[PDB]
Design a protein around this ligand. Structure first.
Ligand SMILES: Oc1cccc(O)c1
Ligand SMILES: Oc1cccc(O)c1
Ligand SMILES: Oc1cccc(O)c1
Ligand SMILES: Oc1cccc(O)c1
Ligand SMILES: Oc1cccc(O)c1
Ligand SMILES: Oc1cccc(O)c1
Ligand SMILES: Oc1cccc(O)c1
Ligand SMILES: Oc1cccc(O)c1
Ligand SMILES: [Cl-]
Ligand SMILES: [Cl-]
Ligand code: NA
Ligand SMILES: [Zn+2]
Ligand SMILES: [Zn+2]
Lengths: 21, 28, 29, 21, 21, 29, 29, 21, 29, 21, 29, 21
């Protein structure tokens, strides 16, 4: 999930863009 | 508690990255 | 409008605390 | 929308729960 | 205290309400 | 300890939102 | 009253940093 | 209260210290 | 004045997020 | 300054990038 | 865990408050 | 560096002032 993926290591803006509508 | 604190910063980063597009936050 | 931009930043943080595991969809318009 | 409803007047935590999934 | 209780485990908004005056 | 310092910062924001008009007292000690 | 709601969110975060171990009382009354 | 005093004009850190315990 | 104070608070957080490793200088005047 | 430019109109993360080191 | 990143987020907010009109520099390296 | 100096032990506002312009 997003926490599993982004709280262990830092997510870039590209990875975060994945969640935009 | 670490994940809860991280999650708070994540939604804020999502808000700024997604702009007027909006976003979906689903931890489960 | 910056005032709406700033208000939404606080809204998302409130939604995060209230929704918890349920999560939420944030759609401006 | 949530903006029109909650940025013009203060929404309580109960009103905000309406927007949860 | 609130820190001992809510920083070691997650407190729900229901639990936090106890610290309102 | 910075981890407690950071946790307290979020706790304060949560209290502000849940307590509303009532206000609250923050006494970590 | 939303401007005031947003301001208070920042006020409590400033009080948290400024007061440190002393803690603080937030009563918007 | 603190809101009237500090949401109209900016309060310095010294002024905010007035509200610490 | 207060509106700008609050706006700046969010501005520095956006700068921290976009600038990442590079860092940044924040000069309001 | 950044305040004059970004507290009146919303600056996108792309525009803000111009202020990085 | 992303501890340094979260720490930085809070340092920037404290620096904004502390430094005021002088502003500040943030270099994570 | 500020990160090495303030992310394990808490820096007082007094110490943080060293990083102001
Ligand atoms: O991986 C993360 C976690 C929190 C904020 C962020 O920008 C990135
Ligand atoms: O009406 C609102 C606006 C922003 C945050 C919040 O908790 C409520
Ligand atoms: O247990 C906690 C700690 C920090 C914020 C929060 O909402 C709950
Ligand atoms: O204590 C509260 C207040 C408002 C909503 C909620 O879920 C809990
Ligand atoms: O639980 C946490 C959160 C942020 C930084 C840290 O060192 C620990
Ligand atoms: O007057 C104010 C209002 C909000 C935060 C702050 O540091 C000062
Ligand atoms: O124009 C702005 C002002 C404040 C925060 C932000 O992300 C953009
Ligand atoms: O040492 C620190 C780290 C983060 C915020 C702060 O006010 C102090
Ligand atoms: Cl604001
Ligand atoms: Cl944190
Ligand atoms: Na780490
Ligand atoms: Zn704000
Ligand atoms: Zn945090």
């Amino acid at each position: 999930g997003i926490v599993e993926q982004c709280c262990t290591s830092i997510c870039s803006l590209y990875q975060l863009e994945n969640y935009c509508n | 508690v670490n994940q809860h604190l991280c999650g708070s910063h994540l939604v804020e980063a999502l808000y700024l990255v997604c702009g007027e597009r909006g976003f979906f936050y689903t931890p489960k």
